Amino acid sequence: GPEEITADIPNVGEAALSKLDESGIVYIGAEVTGGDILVGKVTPKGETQLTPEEKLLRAIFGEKASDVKDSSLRVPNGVSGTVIDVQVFTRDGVEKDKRA
Amino acid sequence: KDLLKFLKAQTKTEEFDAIKIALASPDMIRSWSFGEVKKPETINYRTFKP
Amino acid sequence: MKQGLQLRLSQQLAMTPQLQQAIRLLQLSTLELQQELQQALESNPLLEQIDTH
Amino acid sequence: GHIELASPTAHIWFLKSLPSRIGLLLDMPLRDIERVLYFESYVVIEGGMTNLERQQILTEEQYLDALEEFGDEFDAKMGAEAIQALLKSMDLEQECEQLREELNETNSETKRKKLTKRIKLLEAFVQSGNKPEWMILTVLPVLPPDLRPLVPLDGGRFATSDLNDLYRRVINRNNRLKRLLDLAAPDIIVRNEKRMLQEAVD
Amino acid sequence: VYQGETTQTLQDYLMWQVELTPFSDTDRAIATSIVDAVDETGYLTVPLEDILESIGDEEIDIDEVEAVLKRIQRFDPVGVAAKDLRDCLLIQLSQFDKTTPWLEEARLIISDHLDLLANHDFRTLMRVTRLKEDVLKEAVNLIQSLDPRPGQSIQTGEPEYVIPDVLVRKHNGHWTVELNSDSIPRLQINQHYASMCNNARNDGDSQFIRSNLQDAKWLIKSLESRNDTLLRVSRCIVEQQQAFFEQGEEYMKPMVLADIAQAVEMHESTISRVTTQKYLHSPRGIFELKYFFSSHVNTEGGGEASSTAIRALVKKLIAAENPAKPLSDSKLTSLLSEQGIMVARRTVAKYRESLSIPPSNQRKQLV
Amino acid sequence: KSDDVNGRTKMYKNIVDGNHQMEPGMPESFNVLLKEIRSLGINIELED
Amino acid sequence: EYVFESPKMKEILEKIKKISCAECPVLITGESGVGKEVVARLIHKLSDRSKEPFVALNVASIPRDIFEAELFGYEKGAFTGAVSSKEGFFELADGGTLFLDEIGELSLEAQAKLLRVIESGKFYRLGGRKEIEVNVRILAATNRNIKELVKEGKFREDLYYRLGVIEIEIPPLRERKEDIIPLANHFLKKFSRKYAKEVEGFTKSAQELLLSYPWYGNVRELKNVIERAVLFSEGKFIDRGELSCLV
Amino acid sequence: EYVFESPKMKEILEKIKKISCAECPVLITGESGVGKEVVARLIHKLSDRSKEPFVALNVASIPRDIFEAELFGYEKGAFTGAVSSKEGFFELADGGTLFLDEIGELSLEAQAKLLRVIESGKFYRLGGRKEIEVNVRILAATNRNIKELVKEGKFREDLYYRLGVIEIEIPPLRERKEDIIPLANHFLKKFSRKYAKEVEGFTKSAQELLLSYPWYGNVRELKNVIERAVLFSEGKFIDRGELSCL
DNA sequence: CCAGAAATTGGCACGAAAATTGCAATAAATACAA
DNA sequence: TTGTATTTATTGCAATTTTCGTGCCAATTTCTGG
Ligand SMILES: Nc1ncnc2c1ncn2[C@@H]1O[C@H](COP(=O)(O)OP(=O)(O)OP(=O)(O)O)[C@@H](O)[C@H]1O
Ligand SMILES: Nc1ncnc2c1ncn2[C@@H]1O[C@H](COP(=O)(O)OP(=O)(O)OP(=O)(O)O)[C@@H](O)[C@H]1O
Ligand SMILES: [Mg+2]
């Protein structure tokens, strides 16, 4: 499956996603430091056999958390600044998000 | 059979006091190896296993 | 009239199939096709593959 | 690991590092050794009862006429098999004693230096446990894989390393030579395959 | 030459924490075995009896193994090397401060009744735990705030890709299909040995050379024919499914091998063999060539609707339902009927199961 | 400090424990050199 | 399920248990209808080749002229009309059991062709120059006294000692009077279930008549009599009148 | 691995050794189970053709109408269905040994077909015009009495003198009474090892019982009896009770 | 609140249609010797 | 001028196994009147 850029990362708290807009991209004018999330992305981990422990995990917590793994872009350590510009390049034939 | 001795035996240091160099016999080369390489393939690229 | 095994000169109408050869290459994927091509290269001295070395 | 070579191959360090150990040990010029190794000329192993020396360099037409005249009375070969046969049939003690007698009797300056060098080389070979035919490769060692890793790059491309490419070339040539030898292929092609295997190993 | 560097996995981090922990020799061996038994999600994969057997000494009881395991479970991240989900959640909750508003209720729910929460009862659970709906919502929210997979904090690895065989692109307003030139196999006849075919040369070499030359020519022709057949079949398939590449699924057409076989004038066995383990790259993604063949059901107008479109419609309808009252298969069937799709309840249940979607009673929330 | 794989770990543990002592071993690069020389068809080995 | 109650049948069963670890040829002898095929299939089931083929072959239905081609096979150009290679029965049952049923009807010319294959296990096809080696266990069944045939001269002496490594003889039903009533009850229940009748058992006089009759067809004749009695019954019990076929 | 202890069976071994330098055909006669196959393979092993093929052929298992095709081979186009040339058994066994097992069951029509190949080694393939010459040593074995059959008239006279250059007759086991006990011990050890039992000998009564039975199947019957005794054995010594099958 | 009624789900079964796998030499065109 | 040996051009049929949709019903969950 294809990687998706999204703000719905299952394993992170609500505070870390405060600076991302509805499309999963940081706002213009945000002050960021090392370890902050700039673009949220998930990678399809793939199908499994769905053993009863995995079924229990999916039933109790959810299905989104069990199908994708976080692969976001983060600020490198020892780097800070203000977000002044964001550019989005999309392949022809792919649907554009709201930011684009 | 004891795990302590098994783990301790792979952390030892060899003892030596000299270095020897010479020509290698075909029998010596065969004694070094653990198997014969027959195919030029490296990675399956499908299962990503050797 | 009789059931036996014999050697004789007869005049017969004969049917025969003609399909099986080169049809196995269609089902193979690209990797298996390359492996089979390498195996064919090993045995045939007159076959070569393009190289950049 | 190891690779079983279909035919013997000379070690380039003991051939192309001046002074040539193989040439100085066999008392042959380096040009003749190179010509014999890369399947360009013949060399006599056993002279027989004919007028042929034990290290005489022949050519294709000379070998053909020698065969059509004498027949099965002389043995001639080309490639690394001939060099290994020459190295395997030498007796070091007799060579050493004859060279020492010649050095004691004859007096010169350049010949003195040459005989001294060959005597020292032969006595070094005798004193150590090495044998001359070990300078011709029959089994090829293979380095452990973790010392020659593959390069992983973005997009799922592993590419390749130089050492792995050289190993692949050697293995391909060896396998083709094995298949050609076991099929009784014509000699005009197997000679070219042996030359290419020698070049790949070098 | 860049040789690459070393990375730290979960087990490397756990062993680093083990080495700096005041363990004895036997305790360190037990910890080594336990850390070896931990998988990438942070859960223990073998029973403690296997670890005790692997220690190899008869002087050691299971209680010492339990103590070492409890000590290891407090490493970073907390909850690693847990036996099951209940143990992991209890370990995580044990480290919370006592001032948390709903620690006790969450601990009670996790320790006693975890199957009811998994089955989405929300009715028998209230009776068993004697709680109201005001506190149950907060307790469930606190439970859902924990980490079910503590071992993914040190996640390592890389995705694996696939090289397509045919490329589809929209040029000049119409879709065009070509072969991927980076993966197309090709051969060539060695001109040296081929030109060695001298008539004056010995016949024994000449017959060998001629036979091998004709075999090489036959093999090259076979490869060319295979490539041409693959290109023709792929182009025909893309031409048939032309509305899919412009609007995705829900617009698939129902087609079988007979349609393509009639279109390209070949046998169904050839079409079956060609479209095996071969991929196609489109602006939408990478699809196997067998992805475009599907069954169908009837339609009120008189036409046919593919099963892929019905699965997509079912997923869309389920994903946009009311969490208070989830849709059942009878309700899903009556929603697809207004569009004229004549499908049975059992087929809708089969489609829902194929998408790995729980039944209606197990999807309801506590909103 | 560079390539004694066991020595690095032991030194780190001793430093954290407050014991400033080392147990040096063989550098890994010398083992790599030995393997590389052996791959050339030359028998090089350690004595005693 | 089968019924073994007589002491002789239990002794035969114990022998079958004991010889379960061997791969020797077995020769089964008896009268008609004693249960030779039952014993052969039980031997196959209790052996190490339980999941392997059990090729049962009637050696009297193979034509004389094509006898070799049926058991050994032939290559492509063995004779006129041979189009493709084909295996025999010794190669079809490789790794399993071959059951030669009614071996006493084989003519001497046909018996001479089975000499080397039984012991060696190796043979050549018809038109093949490569030796085929197989691993087949030989069970043979007959209802004629093989020893008497060998002494008379109607059976080859070289084959009896190859086949008769282990010999089992099944006694007639006339000597197994402890085994008659259970068989009658078994067949009665089977046929009552099959035909949906209402019979349940035999009267005491009927039991006496059944036990006193010198059965010549053995279990097959008993089964036929029970089936006829069930078919023509009308009452709850099968009295002496329904068994009017017996004299 | 074979047992040769009787005085009659050692003269045969000496005679086999003495003919190691010969290439004449050999004819082996006896009863059934005496060991004709053992003697034939020992003759082959102790000769100069030790590494050469040993083709054992049951001459009674070849169909009547394809006898020549099997023995000599055929060329392409010889008959309808001959799509390629195929060699025979005389070419298959070229340079080695051909063992015609059970030669006594060959019809008079089939005996006249191999009348020139035995002495000359030259023949023509079916549909072939060139003459083929082979170098094969012929061993034949039979349990009949070939001389008596020739006297009767059901065996060809011209074949007996082509085959019987050297004649070896193996006495029955009932007369080689020095071999019964060594053979019994050999077979007992073999079968005890194979079936993983604990038997290691016979009692005195069992030995006295094995020395009086008139073995009709000879060594094969003895082997069968020992195998039955081992399979049904219980203790460590085979008593007379286990040998009631005699 | 309780218990009977009703709706829901999935394992098994049925026929029908669709996909998969075994089979191995010929038809015809063209250049060459009388 | 022709009859014949050699070289390109043939990428299907026929069983057999597997998957499709949809009905029956036992077990389970949800609903509603007294
Ligand atoms: N002990 C038994 N229990 C149940 N049924 C039995 C038993 N013995 C024999 N039979 C039945 O007897 C019938 C005839 O027996 P079977 O087929 O073995 O005959 P047979 O010995 O091969 O005869 P024949 O020599 O006439 O071919 C079979 O249908 C079989 O089921
Ligand atoms: N001297 C011996 N030592 C050991 N085993 C022997 C000896 N003689 C015969 N045997 C055994 O006796 C068995 C029968 O022998 P063999 O096959 O030679 O008998 P045959 O009837 O003469 O041969 P065939 O009928 O096959 O031509 C074989 O298993 C063989 O091993
Ligand atoms: Mg029967």
UniProtKB/TrEMBL annotation, chain G:
ATP binds at V3, S32, G33, V34, G35, K36, E37, V38, N143, R162, R220, K223. Its main location: cytoplasm. ADP 1 binds at Y2, V3, G33, V34, G35, K36, E37, V38, R220, K223. Mg(2+) 3 binds at D101, E102. ADP 2 binds at V3, G33, V34, G35, K36, E37, V38, R220. It is found in: Cytoplasm. GO terms for molecular function: ATP binding; cis-regulatory region sequence-specific DNA binding; DNA-binding transcription activator activity; identical protein binding; metal ion binding. The keyword Metal-binding applies. ADP 3 binds at V3, G33, G35, K36, E37, V38, R220. ADP 5 binds at S32, G33, K36, E37, R220. Coiled coil: none annotated. GO terms for cellular component: cytoplasm; protein-DNA complex. Keywords: Activator, ATP-binding, Cytoplasm, DNA-binding, Metal-binding, Nucleotide-binding, Phosphoprotein, Transcription, Transcription regulation, Two-component regulatory system. Residues 2-231 form the Sigma-54 factor interaction domain. The keyword RNA-binding does not apply. Mg(2+) 2 binds at E37, D101. Disulfide bonds join C21-C24. ADP 4 binds at V3, G33, G35, K36, E37, V38, R220. GO terms for biological process: phosphorelay signal transduction system; positive regulation of DNA-templated transcription. This is Transcriptional regulator (NtrC family). It comes from Aquifex aeolicus (strain VF5). The chain holds residues 138 to 384 of 439 of the full protein.
